[PDB]
Ligand binder design. Structure first.
Ligand SMILES: O=C(O)CCC(=O)C(=O)O
Ligand code: NI
Lengths: 329, 68, 13
């Protein structure tokens, strides 16, 4: 890394106001139908969101115990933005290490904990449940068949991207990126805090981003300096943040923090979702860092819309029977 | 007769054009789908019929796609 | 080494 991160946190140049501050009760389906979820949102308190979180004092060791000591976890080497692997037990030992004794800065942002004990301790915003393509479009019997709690692709019966735990030590940085498949995102700051840089997905910015990615020169170029309008904003303990499709962001961790969040696709910004997919195609992103079964899901979306509206099914007979049996429950 | 948002109408048109235009080895038609071509056709017809959706009547507060 | 999917990470430098 060739730019000074400490200057990026102090300057006032990132002064756009993209984020809308909202009350939980106002974040409903009608709000989504009206605005199409185009604006980033911050809920300074959880009231009215329908979220559920663990005990405020829940630790990384409690996470370990819920998901398994031997579970392999994807870790990010902050200095290089490369990825490595270690068991959750090793991750925990690192995280419990005093700050001065940590040799490297490491970050975990990709621990998907669905189908573990922890899954039920965290509930998403109700509104996301109403619109998430996974919950509303993927054949339910496949989703319910999932047994595996890691993200092993051969075991994966549906796009396993709904519930993540993020564990970040003081000084962690995640460089500019758009979330996979053009997913939208919700993040709840359980303990600690985060600083985000936000860049809107205008055609010009998305062209810059794609160019910046093909350049290979992302350690050297701070992308918020190459755009017209960027917002730096801090999230405090207890806040919830929603990031729309395609928004380009980077994240800094000022204090040891624990976040629960997830990804979702939905039906009100499909064009942007498709744009980001094909940016991934062009920049040659390994399949592992992508939304699993993207187009498969897209097919199922078409079928759901036709069916709910016209009552003509284009699912196989077996799939129709599987579905009817779920409706009988 | 029913009213989608423009967000949705524009979306599903992009979707259908995208999926139709993919070569067979990139199409990723999943296991549960019977006849993709027939599905494409029905989406096209449907989009014709809903072009005339009233924007303020589409603001129902409940999504079109819900499990029964 | 089982192949995974749905890993959240930006491009490496
Ligand atoms: O919290 C972080 O450091 C990175 C958050 C993020 O953008 C992600 O997980 O995709
Ligand atoms: Ni992100």
């Amino acid at each position: 890394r060739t730019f000074d991160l400490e200057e990026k946190l102090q300057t006032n140049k990132y002064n756009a106001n993209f984020v809308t501050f909202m009350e939980g009760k106002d974040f409903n389906v009608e709000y989504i139908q009206r605005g199409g979820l185009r604006d980033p949102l911050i809920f300074k308190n959880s009231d009215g969101l329908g979220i559920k979180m663990p005990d405020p004092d829940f630790t990384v060791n409690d996470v370990k115990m819920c998901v398994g000591s031997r579970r392999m976890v994807d870790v990010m080497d902050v200095n290089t933005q490369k990825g490595i692997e270690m068991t959750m037990a090793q991750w925990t030992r690192y995280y419990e290490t005093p700050e001065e004794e940590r040799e490297k800065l490491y970050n975990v942002i990709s621990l998907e904990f669905s189908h573990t004990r922890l899954e039920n301790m965290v509930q998403r915003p109700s509104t996301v449940d109403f619109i998430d393509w996974v919950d509303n479009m993927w054949p339910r019997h496949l989703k319910e068949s999932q047994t595996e709690s890691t993200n092993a692709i051969l075991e994966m019966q549906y796009p396993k991207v709904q519930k993540y735990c993020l564990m970040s030590v003081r000084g962690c940085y995640t460089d500019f990126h758009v979330d996979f498949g053009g997913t939208s995102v919700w993040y709840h700051i359980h303990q600690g805090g985060k600083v985000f840089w936000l860049i809107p997905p205008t055609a010009h910015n998305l062209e810059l981003y794609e160019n910046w990615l093909l350049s290979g020169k992302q350690g050297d170029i701070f992308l918020g300096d190459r755009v017209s309008d960027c917002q730096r904003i801090e999230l405090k303990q207890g806040y919830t943040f929603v990031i729309p499709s395609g928004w380009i962001h980077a994240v800094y961790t000022p204090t040891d923090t624990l976040v629960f969040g997830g990804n979702f696709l939905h039906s009100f910004n499909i064009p942007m979702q498709l744009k980001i997919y094909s940016i991934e195609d062009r920049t040659r992103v390994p399949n592992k860092f992508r939304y699993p079964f993207y187009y498969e899901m897209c097919w199922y979306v078409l079928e759901r819309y036709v069916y709910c509206i016209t009552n003509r099914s284009h699912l196989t007979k077996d799939f129709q029977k599987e579905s009817l049996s779920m409706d009988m429950e | 007769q029913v009213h989608l948002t423009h967000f949705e109408l524009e979306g599903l048109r992009c979707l259908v054009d995208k999926l139709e235009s993919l070569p067979l080895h990139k199409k990723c038609v999943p296991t549960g789908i019977e006849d993709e071509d027939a599905l494409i056709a029905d989406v096209k017809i449907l989009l014709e019929e809903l072009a005339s959706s009233d924007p303020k009547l589409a603001l129902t507060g409940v999504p079109i796609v819900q499990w029964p | 080494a089982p192949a995974t999917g749905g890993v959240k990470k930006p491009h490496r430098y």
